[PDB]
Amino acid sequence: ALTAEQKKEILGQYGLHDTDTGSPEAQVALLTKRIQDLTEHLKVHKHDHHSRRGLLLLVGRRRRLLKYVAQVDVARYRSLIERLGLRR
Amino acid sequence: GIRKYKPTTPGRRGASVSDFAEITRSTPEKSLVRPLHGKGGRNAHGRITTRHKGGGHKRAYRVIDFRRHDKDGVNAKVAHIEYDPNRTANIALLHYLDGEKRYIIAPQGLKQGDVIESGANADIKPGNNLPLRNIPAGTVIHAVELRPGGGAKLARSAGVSIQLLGKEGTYAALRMPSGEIRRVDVRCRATVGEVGNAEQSNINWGKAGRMRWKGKRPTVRGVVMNPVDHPHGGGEGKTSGGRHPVSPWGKPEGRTRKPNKPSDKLIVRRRRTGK
RNA sequence: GGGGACCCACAUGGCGUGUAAGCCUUUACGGCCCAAGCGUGAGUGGGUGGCACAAACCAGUGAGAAGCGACUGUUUACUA
RNA sequence: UCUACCCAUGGCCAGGGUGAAGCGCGGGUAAGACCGCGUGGAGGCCCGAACCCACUUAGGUUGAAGACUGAGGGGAUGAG
RNA sequence: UCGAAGGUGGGAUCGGCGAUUGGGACGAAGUCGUAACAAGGUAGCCGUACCGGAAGGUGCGGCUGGAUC
RNA sequence: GGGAGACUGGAAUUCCUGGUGUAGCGGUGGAAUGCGCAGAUAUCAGGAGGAACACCGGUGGCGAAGGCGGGUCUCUGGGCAGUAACUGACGCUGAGGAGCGAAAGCGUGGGGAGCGAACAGGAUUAGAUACCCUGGUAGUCCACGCCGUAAACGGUGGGUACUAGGUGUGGGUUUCCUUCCUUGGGAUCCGUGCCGUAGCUAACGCAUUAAGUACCCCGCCUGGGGAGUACGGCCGCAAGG
RNA sequence: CGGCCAACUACGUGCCAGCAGCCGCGGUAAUACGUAGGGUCCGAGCGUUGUCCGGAAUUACUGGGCGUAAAGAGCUCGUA
RNA sequence: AUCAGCUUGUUGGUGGGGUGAUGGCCUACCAAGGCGACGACGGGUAGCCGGCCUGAGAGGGUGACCGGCCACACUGGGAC
Ligand SMILES: [Mg+2]
Ligand SMILES: [Mg+2]
Ligand SMILES: [Mg+2]
Ligand SMILES: [Mg+2]
Ligand SMILES: [Mg+2]
Ligand SMILES: [Mg+2]
Ligand SMILES: [Mg+2]
Ligand SMILES: [Mg+2]
Ligand SMILES: [Mg+2]
Ligand SMILES: [Mg+2]
Ligand SMILES: [Mg+2]
Ligand SMILES: [Mg+2]
Ligand SMILES: [Mg+2]
Ligand SMILES: [Mg+2]
Ligand SMILES: [Mg+2]
Ligand SMILES: [Mg+2]
Ligand SMILES: [Mg+2]
Ligand SMILES: [Mg+2]
Ligand SMILES: [Mg+2]
Ligand SMILES: [Mg+2]
Ligand SMILES: [Mg+2]
Ligand SMILES: [Mg+2]
Ligand SMILES: [Mg+2]
Ligand SMILES: [Mg+2]
Ligand SMILES: [Mg+2]
Ligand SMILES: [Mg+2]
Ligand SMILES: [Mg+2]
Ligand SMILES: [Mg+2]
Ligand SMILES: [Mg+2]
Ligand SMILES: [Mg+2]
Ligand SMILES: [Mg+2]
Ligand SMILES: [Mg+2]
Ligand SMILES: [Mg+2]
Ligand SMILES: [Mg+2]
Ligand SMILES: [Mg+2]
Ligand SMILES: [Mg+2]
Ligand SMILES: [Mg+2]
Ligand SMILES: [Mg+2]
Ligand SMILES: [Mg+2]
Ligand SMILES: [Mg+2]
Ligand SMILES: [Mg+2]
Ligand SMILES: [Mg+2]
Ligand SMILES: [Mg+2]
Ligand SMILES: [Mg+2]
Ligand SMILES: [Mg+2]
Ligand SMILES: [Mg+2]
Ligand SMILES: [Mg+2]
Ligand SMILES: [Mg+2]
Ligand SMILES: [Mg+2]
Ligand SMILES: [Mg+2]
Ligand SMILES: [Mg+2]
Ligand SMILES: [Mg+2]
Ligand SMILES: [Mg+2]
Ligand SMILES: [Mg+2]
Ligand SMILES: [Mg+2]
Ligand SMILES: [Mg+2]
Ligand SMILES: [Mg+2]
Ligand SMILES: [Mg+2]
Ligand SMILES: [Mg+2]
Ligand SMILES: [Mg+2]
Ligand SMILES: [Mg+2]
Ligand SMILES: [Mg+2]
Ligand SMILES: [Mg+2]
Ligand SMILES: [Mg+2]
Ligand SMILES: [Mg+2]
Ligand SMILES: [Mg+2]
Ligand SMILES: [Mg+2]
Ligand SMILES: [Mg+2]
Ligand SMILES: [Mg+2]
Ligand SMILES: [Mg+2]
Ligand SMILES: [Mg+2]
Ligand SMILES: [Mg+2]
Ligand SMILES: [Mg+2]
Ligand SMILES: [Mg+2]
Ligand SMILES: [Mg+2]
Ligand SMILES: [Mg+2]
Ligand SMILES: [Mg+2]
Ligand SMILES: [Mg+2]
Ligand SMILES: [Mg+2]
Ligand SMILES: [Mg+2]
Ligand SMILES: [Mg+2]
Ligand SMILES: [Mg+2]
Ligand SMILES: [Mg+2]
Ligand SMILES: [Mg+2]
Ligand SMILES: [Mg+2]
Ligand SMILES: [Mg+2]
Ligand SMILES: [Mg+2]
Ligand SMILES: [Mg+2]
Ligand SMILES: [Mg+2]
Ligand SMILES: [Mg+2]
Ligand SMILES: [Mg+2]
Ligand SMILES: [Mg+2]
Ligand SMILES: [Mg+2]
Ligand SMILES: [Mg+2]
Ligand SMILES: [Mg+2]
Ligand SMILES: [Mg+2]
Ligand SMILES: [Mg+2]
Ligand SMILES: [Mg+2]
Ligand SMILES: [Mg+2]
Ligand SMILES: [Mg+2]
Ligand SMILES: [Mg+2]
Ligand SMILES: [Mg+2]
Ligand SMILES: [Mg+2]
Ligand SMILES: [Mg+2]
C-alpha cells in the first residue's frame, strides 16, 4: 500500500490543481501505481488468491473509470493513455 | 527448469530435458583442460572390467578444486556458471583476487555476482568452504572431506547432500542422504548449502543414442542368456531360471560390505531402505 | 479427379544480373540506380497434329479387419 | 591382417520435402494463458543414389563363385 | 460454352434388421437376507475412494431434516 | 484466525541407545490371535524424526464462498467512523465467456510419528465377505500440475428505499452527572446471537440480518419411475465431469 | 338408471362368466355382471371412436413459485 | 445448438454484354472481405391470408366451403 510521501507526490504531480485529490486523473494514477507495485510483488508470491481478488477488483474499477473518461472527453482520455503509455 | 519436447518423431515422443538456462559461457577455459579419453569400460590390461558401459562420446577433462585449502582469506566473485557434463552438477568458475581461477562445484541457487570466501572468516552463503570449527550444527552441507586436509570426497549429490547433526569432543556427526549417521573429525572441510540441478532427477532419457553417448551399453537379460554364460541361462520359452537371482559372476544378493574398515568404528549403523 | 505437346499474342511484360552514363563522398580494389546487353521461369486466351501430349528411361498398388511386438535398431558370416 | 568388442587419429553420406522451441508484429489479459501472421530447420523425421545390409523369386548347386548373379527389397545425419 | 439423364469414389443424416449382451418396468409367491423408519438395536444423510452374492461396510470432509445428558 | 514465504517454541506418540527392575503387558459384554522369559510392561537419562497447536476458544472475528487460528518477521487485500476537499450520471444486475473452490482420486519427485480404505488372522451368530479385537498397504504430509463435484444449508441470488420493540456481543466517534475511576448516562454508524407486533404463509414458521410491502436484472421448476441414464457434442492422461 | 351425474327393484351364476371415463364392482343372499319390468335423457336421430379449445392460474404479460413438496448455479471479477 | 461459424461471382468498385426496365442478370480487370450470439449457416415440418372452433378477454388450436394470391400438371430439363 502506498504511503503519504509518494502518494501526495503522485496526487500533486498528476493533479489538475494543487488541492483536488478525487479527480479521475489522480484516481487512475493511484490505481496504476498500486497495480504495478503489487503485481511486482505477486511475480514473487504466486498463490495469493486473496490478493489476486484485489487485482481483479481494482482492475475492473480502473476499467470503469477509463470508460468514464473516454465517454466524457476523448481528448483527455487520449492524453491520459498516452502519458501513462498503456494500451487501453 | 523442465521443458518437455513435442512428439515430432515416434522416438523422441517421451524425451524431456532440464533446459540449462543456468549457462553463461559456452566455450570452456582452454588452459585448465587435461587430456582425457573414454576408457571404454576397460583397464590398460585389455579385459572388459565392467560390462554394460563403454564406448560413446569422447569427452575432455578439467580439474575441479574439490579440496580448496591452498589459498584462504581472499574473496572471489562468480565468474561464469558453465556446464561440465562429467558430473551431474555444474561448475562455476571464480575470479579470485590473486588471479588464480579454479573450477568449483556450483551450489543450489548460485547466480553470477555473489562473493565467495574460503577460510575461517567465511560466512554462511553457499559456496564457502570452511572447517567444522566455524559452522553451526544443523546446517546443510556438501562436498565434505574426511580429514583435516586430505581432499574432499563425499556429499556432492545434486539435490540432497549431507546434513550436520552435532559436535561432541573431537568427533562430528554427519547425516547421510540414506538416513544414516557417520562419525567424522571436527576439523574436516565442508561447504554450506545444497548442490544445484535438483530438477535433473526429472530428466527423461528418451532413446538409445543419448545413452550410448552418456556411456552405458545395452543390458542383456539373463533369462535369455545362454546357460553356460549365466546361471539364469537356458530354457525353451520364458523362464526365470528356477532359482533366486544371482549375478553371473558367482555371488547372489546379500551382504557385500566387508566390515572392519578404519572408519567402520566411525559408523553408528547401516542404511535401512523403504521406511 | 482435373491440366501437362507445339506455335502465336498478351509480351520491347514480370524477375535476376549488370555496362555506358547519372547521383554522392571519409577519392577508393568506394555506396545508390542502371538505358543498352545477357539469362529467365509462370499464366490466360486463340490455333494446330496424333489413338495416346509426366508419351522414352526413370518412377508408391490401394482399401478393410484382427494377433504379437510400443517404434528406429541387432543377431543364427555359409538353411531361420 | 576376417569376424566380436573397445581405444586414438582421419574420411564418407548427391538431391527433394515435413517445419519445435525461440524471435518481432496485430489481437487477448491488468499480467497471463491463448489466437494468426512473417524468419527455424530441431528430428535415432520422410522420399530417394554413393555406402552398409541381406526379405522374396529365378538361375546356378562335379557353378563364373567352398554361400554368388539377375530383378525387385530395408536403413540411408546416425544405436550410422 | 451451358446443359437433364447415366456412371464413377469417398464423407453426413434418416433409418430397418442383426447372434449375444447391458439395463428398466410390470407380474406374484418363493429362497437368501436386516438395509431404512423409534438412540431401528453401529444416528441418519451428502460428496468421494476401496471392498463384498445382495441390501451394505469402512476411510476422509460437510449438515442436523438426531434422542438423551 | 484475511492471504503467502521464511525463521522459531513447548507438550504428546513412536522408534533407537544405556541404567534399574521383575513374570507377565495390551485388550472387550467375556476371551483368543498380539509382544515377552533372547528380559516385556513400568521407570529414569539422551537422541532422532513426522503431524498438529490443548487452555484463550464463545453460538465471538474475518473472508465473496469454500474456509481460516503456537509465536516472530517480511509484503499485501477487504471493511468501519468522523472532515466532508475533489470527480460530477461514472450506479445496478449480468445470457454466452473467463478465474477461485471441502474431501477424496490421478502423474512426477520427496516425506511418512500418529491415524487409517483394502487384506490377514482372533471373536459372535444357524450364517458375518459387518458392527468388536490384534496388525497394517494406498492415502493422510511437501512442490508442481491436474478432476471440479458436496444436505457447496440460512435447503432463501445480488442491490436499493420504507415499516413497532425488548435483551447480549464486537469496532469507532461524541457529549453530560462527572469522581471525571464507572458495561455511569446519552447520541451516532457498521457487524453478529435470542424472543417477539402488524403482516405473510397450507402449516411448522420468518418477522429491519424478512419468507413484510416494492423496484431492477439473472438462474432454476411444470406428476412419480425411466433418468441425471443411452446416443451425440465439450473438458479431463484416466477415474470421470 | 354406485358416486361424480336428472333415472331402482326383482330374477340367474358367485374371485367364475363379466363392467368400466376416476374412484372402483362379484370369495352364495350385487341398486356397479346378465335378464326382466319400472323410470330418466335424447329423438329421425341415438352412442361409441379420433382430432382441437375451455375448465388447466397445469407454461401464470394481465395471472405461479424457488426453506422444507420442483427449483438459487459453489462463489466472485467482468465483456456484449 | 444433442446445428457455431458460413461463403469464393462470395462481397464491393470500374469497363463491356444483357433484358421492356436498374441490377454479379452474364464477362473481364482491381481490393478482401460481407453475413455471424438483438441466433448466420445447418436439421424436421408445412402453401400463405380474409376466415372457423374454443375462450369474458388475453390466448390457444386450425386453413372444411367460399374468396385474394402462390406453386405444379407422370418424373427431369430446354426453347419457339
Ligand atoms: Mg492496509
Ligand atoms: Mg518415449
Ligand atoms: Mg583433462
Ligand atoms: Mg596377462
Ligand atoms: Mg549394466
Ligand atoms: Mg569408437
Ligand atoms: Mg550436467
Ligand atoms: Mg537384463
Ligand atoms: Mg539370449
Ligand atoms: Mg553354469
Ligand atoms: Mg564363451
Ligand atoms: Mg532359454
Ligand atoms: Mg512353459
Ligand atoms: Mg536370493
Ligand atoms: Mg545409509
Ligand atoms: Mg555498380
Ligand atoms: Mg556525382
Ligand atoms: Mg553515404
Ligand atoms: Mg490427339
Ligand atoms: Mg525396422
Ligand atoms: Mg533390432
Ligand atoms: Mg552375427
Ligand atoms: Mg542363416
Ligand atoms: Mg549370413
Ligand atoms: Mg537366413
Ligand atoms: Mg522448418
Ligand atoms: Mg512457441
Ligand atoms: Mg520407399
Ligand atoms: Mg542373396
Ligand atoms: Mg537347381
Ligand atoms: Mg557356368
Ligand atoms: Mg573355401
Ligand atoms: Mg541386388
Ligand atoms: Mg518380380
Ligand atoms: Mg533402395
Ligand atoms: Mg528413417
Ligand atoms: Mg539410425
Ligand atoms: Mg439406430
Ligand atoms: Mg435386431
Ligand atoms: Mg423372506
Ligand atoms: Mg436396522
Ligand atoms: Mg444390527
Ligand atoms: Mg442406521
Ligand atoms: Mg445408517
Ligand atoms: Mg457416497
Ligand atoms: Mg471397510
Ligand atoms: Mg464427515
Ligand atoms: Mg427430521
Ligand atoms: Mg506459498
Ligand atoms: Mg533404554
Ligand atoms: Mg521408555
Ligand atoms: Mg517418519
Ligand atoms: Mg465545491
Ligand atoms: Mg458495486
Ligand atoms: Mg454486471
Ligand atoms: Mg454487467
Ligand atoms: Mg450468457
Ligand atoms: Mg452465465
Ligand atoms: Mg483458469
Ligand atoms: Mg486454470
Ligand atoms: Mg483430507
Ligand atoms: Mg486434497
Ligand atoms: Mg487411484
Ligand atoms: Mg500427484
Ligand atoms: Mg510419489
Ligand atoms: Mg493402524
Ligand atoms: Mg478400522
Ligand atoms: Mg502374513
Ligand atoms: Mg476380516
Ligand atoms: Mg449441484
Ligand atoms: Mg460451507
Ligand atoms: Mg447464491
Ligand atoms: Mg434485493
Ligand atoms: Mg443496527
Ligand atoms: Mg396481526
Ligand atoms: Mg393466516
Ligand atoms: Mg418476530
Ligand atoms: Mg431484509
Ligand atoms: Mg416468496
Ligand atoms: Mg430403480
Ligand atoms: Mg431426472
Ligand atoms: Mg456421445
Ligand atoms: Mg343413478
Ligand atoms: Mg341422478
Ligand atoms: Mg343376485
Ligand atoms: Mg324405460
Ligand atoms: Mg378441451
Ligand atoms: Mg407484471
Ligand atoms: Mg403459475
Ligand atoms: Mg424441494
Ligand atoms: Mg440450488
Ligand atoms: Mg449444481
Ligand atoms: Mg456493369
Ligand atoms: Mg447505368
Ligand atoms: Mg445482378
Ligand atoms: Mg464485368
Ligand atoms: Mg386474423
Ligand atoms: Mg379467455
Ligand atoms: Mg386462454
Ligand atoms: Mg393459418
Ligand atoms: Mg375465388
Ligand atoms: Mg399481387
Ligand atoms: Mg413439371
Ligand atoms: Mg416442373
mmCIF file of C-alpha atoms (C1' of nucleotides) in Angstrom, chain G residues 52-55 57 61-63 80, chain H residues 38 54-61:
data_model
loop_
_atom_site.group_PDB
_atom_site.id
_atom_site.type_symbol
_atom_site.label_atom_id
_atom_site.label_comp_id
_atom_site.label_asym_id
_atom_site.label_seq_id
_atom_site.Cartn_x
_atom_site.Cartn_y
_atom_site.Cartn_z
ATOM 1 C "C1'" C G 52 -58.779 -29.190 -31.291
ATOM 2 C "C1'" C G 53 -60.008 -25.308 -27.037
ATOM 3 C "C1'" G G 54 -62.009 -24.459 -22.194
ATOM 4 C "C1'" G G 55 -62.063 -25.674 -17.065
ATOM 5 C "C1'" A G 57 -53.925 -19.777 -12.784
ATOM 6 C "C1'" C G 61 -47.809 -10.437 -19.723
ATOM 7 C "C1'" U G 62 -52.784 -9.430 -17.457
ATOM 8 C "C1'" G G 63 -52.069 -14.328 -13.921
ATOM 9 C "C1'" A G 80 -21.973 -7.754 -25.172
ATOM 10 C "C1'" C H 38 -30.513 -8.221 -30.957
ATOM 11 C "C1'" U H 54 -62.835 -22.578 -28.230
ATOM 12 C "C1'" G H 55 -62.076 -18.903 -24.511
ATOM 13 C "C1'" A H 56 -65.244 -12.844 -20.996
ATOM 14 C "C1'" G H 57 -60.571 -11.119 -22.590
ATOM 15 C "C1'" A H 58 -55.573 -12.240 -23.460
ATOM 16 C "C1'" G H 59 -54.577 -16.571 -25.834
ATOM 17 C "C1'" G H 60 -54.682 -21.496 -27.911
ATOM 18 C "C1'" G H 61 -55.913 -24.750 -31.905
#
